[PDB]
């Protein structure tokens, strides 16, 4: 396929504040979303349809992480917490602390009995999910953690930071297995492994992309036009139709590219704030995206490719 | 904090 033809199909509006985050469950049926108001909602993937609010974190959240169950959720708020939710129930099933500052992302590895989060304490930790212990506190960075993601079996993490490295991480051990540098130096504001697991994709606060082979250290693809100046914007790899490089973008737009000739394929507006959030569904050729505080909604996208 | 701006440029 030449280029996507996303249109938008729903505007999903409830959140009383900016929407930090948006994922999808991956049995591909839920949206879950997070804000800065406190809350998480859960959303109908295919009708849009609001279906319920799960409250209890005591500050904004900046981040939401499914279970491989499509069930269990946890999430990553100012409160220096991260919860463990039941969806189906509505419950918290276990506060995670230990951080000493805002947590502001977090995933769950595959097998789906750890948790990695990242904080403004300038470490990643990793938690066990049944007990809600911390297992390890990496030393990762020296500055807040914007990103953290576990590769495709769970053997490792990458993680980036403010302080303008990406790291990967042997998650067993603890140990960083590579840091991959920048001249210039920018902060790095997003970052996550490939589906295949043998590249990583990193945003940095001077409007760039990059594709990166992390074992060899070398920069294989720049995605460029759209605006990322100021915030910690989640960026994706779309593989159920055409493979595309999507991302949020300063100018309230939804930019999405071609992965191999890195042109710009789409520009999907409609958001009247920073997209601050975007995810691609496991199964159709789906994107939900999310904006700040002049817009607070979420919209659903469909395409044929 | 995510939906606010906090790095250096």
């Known amino acids: ?305 | 904090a995510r939906t606010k701006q906090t790095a250096r440029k």
């Open chain 1, 1 to 305: 396929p030449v280029k996507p033809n996303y249109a938008l199909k729903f505007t999903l509006a409830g959140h009383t504040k900016a929407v930090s985050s948006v994922k999808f469950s991956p049995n591909g049926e839920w949206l879950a979303s997070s804000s800065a108001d406190k809350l998480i909602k859960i959303w109908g993937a295919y009708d849009g349809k609001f279906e319920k609010t799960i409250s209890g974190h005591k500050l904004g959240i900046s981040d939401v992480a499914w279970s491989s169950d499509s069930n269990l959720l946890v999430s990553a708020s100012d409160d220096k917490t991260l919860k463990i939710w039941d969806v189906s129930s509505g419950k918290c099933l276990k506060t995670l602390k230990g951080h000493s500052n805002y947590v502001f992302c977090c995933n769950f590895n595959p097998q789906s009995n750890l948790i990695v989060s990242g904080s403004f304490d300038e470490s990643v930790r990793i938690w066990d999910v049944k007990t809600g212990k911390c297992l390890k506190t990496l030393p990762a960075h020296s500055d807040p953690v914007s990103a953290v993601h576990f590769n495709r079996d769970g053997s490792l993490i990458v993680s980036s930071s403010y302080d303008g490295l990406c790291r990967i991480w042997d998650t067993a051990s603890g140990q960083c297995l590579k840091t991959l540098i920048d001249d210039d130096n920018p902060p790095v504001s997003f970052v996550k492994f490939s589906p295949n697991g043998k590249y990583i994709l990193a945003a940095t606060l001077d409007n760039t992309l990059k594709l990166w082979d992390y074992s060899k250290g070398k920069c294989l693809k720049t995605y460029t036009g759209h605006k990322n100046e100021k915030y910690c914007i989640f960026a994706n790899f779309s593989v159920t139709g055409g493979k595309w490089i999507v991302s949020g973008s300063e100018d309230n737009l939804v930019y999405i590219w071609n992965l191999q000739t890195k042109e710009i394929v789409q520009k999907l507006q409609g958001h009247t704030d920073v997209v601050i959030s975007t995810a691609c569904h496991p199964t159709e050729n789906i994107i939900a995206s999310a904006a700040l505080e002049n817009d607070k909604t979420i919209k659903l996208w469909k395409s044929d490719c």
